[PDB]
Amino acid sequence: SDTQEVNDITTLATLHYNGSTPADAFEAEVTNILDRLNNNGIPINNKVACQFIMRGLSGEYKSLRYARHRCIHMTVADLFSDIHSMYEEQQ
């Protein structure tokens, strides 16, 4: 509660996703961290968010990381689309 921002930032910096849990749940976790950080006056822009998410991708999802260099132009929604697409074509 008093440590929500520190916990949210720590989570963001230590994300991991390998497809073994629903992509929706991963998207929710990340989305809400970003929302809460925004509310607490710590705005994480699209580029930085994208980089944290990419860093977290393991297993087959590692492959999405070769777009990390375009994070500036890539939207978080676009990235989540690709993760969702990969999740679907693993199920």
Added chain:
Amino acid sequence: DTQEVNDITTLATLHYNGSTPADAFEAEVTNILDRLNNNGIPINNKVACQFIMRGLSGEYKSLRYARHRCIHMTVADLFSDIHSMYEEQQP
């Protein structure tokens, strides 16, 4: 282009046990906070204080009991206490 992610990761993984000068530790953290501020990721006194406390090891772990007042405690005040402990430990 990954300066923010690197600066946040460092903040979230600080370690200090007195084995290096307190001035160097202060410098590292201060400049992370400065750069994050510049890049539109403003870490306030409370959150900064919490990250610093989390990183204290060895004899310095003991300082982690003012953590609850980080809201009212300043980063400068905490670095004072670390400096004070560092001085005591020196010849």
